[PDB]
A and B are shown apart, each in its own frame.
Chain A
Amino acid sequence: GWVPVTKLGRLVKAGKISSIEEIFLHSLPVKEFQIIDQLLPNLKDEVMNIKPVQKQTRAGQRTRFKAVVVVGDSNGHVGLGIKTAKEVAGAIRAGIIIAKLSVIPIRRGYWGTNLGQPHSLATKTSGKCGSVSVRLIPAPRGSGIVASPAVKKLMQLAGVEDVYTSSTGSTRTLENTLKAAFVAIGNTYGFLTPNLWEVQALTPSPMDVYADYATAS
Chain B
Amino acid sequence: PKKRASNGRNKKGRGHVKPVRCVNCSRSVPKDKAIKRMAIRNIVEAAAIRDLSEASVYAEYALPKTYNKLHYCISCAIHARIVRVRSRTDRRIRAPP
Chains A and B share a contact (CB less than 8 Å): no
